[PDB]
Amino acid sequence: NSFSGYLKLTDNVYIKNADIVEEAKKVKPTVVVNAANVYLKHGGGVAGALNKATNNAMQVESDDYIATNGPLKVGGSCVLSGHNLAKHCLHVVGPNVNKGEDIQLLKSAYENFNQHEVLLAPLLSAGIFGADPIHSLRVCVDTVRTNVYLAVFDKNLYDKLVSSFL
């Protein structure tokens, strides 16, 4: 968990402008969080980038998980291998508010982080899921109590989050 160059936002939330894939390779954290969908189909965004970095090993494992256990629910999670990126990958489903999924489930999604002492993660429900990323950072800060290191790819978004917060 050799996190470097993070800005401390609260006693347990840290933020950096970085590619989460590169952070996972440099740090080899105990847990990397995936911004997943209920069928664990890692087609784009952060999910597609993490899967690509494992050379599809994450997708083959995810398919076997779904055949045995069924899909997750919105607001839920499962722990699978982190492959070459981490000891574990915590797959978490935030609501896709553009498909009518309730924004109240974004608190349930962040609650899954509390089963892990330290996590490297993206903001949930940002990008294609449609939630406002600054609102997602506020829910993370209010809900997560363990130590979370957030990676934000886009520098324009990172500066907006740091300005709104501090």
Ligand SMILES: O=C(O)C1=C(c2ccc3nccnc3c2)CCC1
């Ligand atoms: O900074 C982020 O967590 C966000 C996104 C991201 C991040 C890394 C990605 N890497 C490759 C392709 N697409 C990506 C999208 C999309 C929404 C916010």
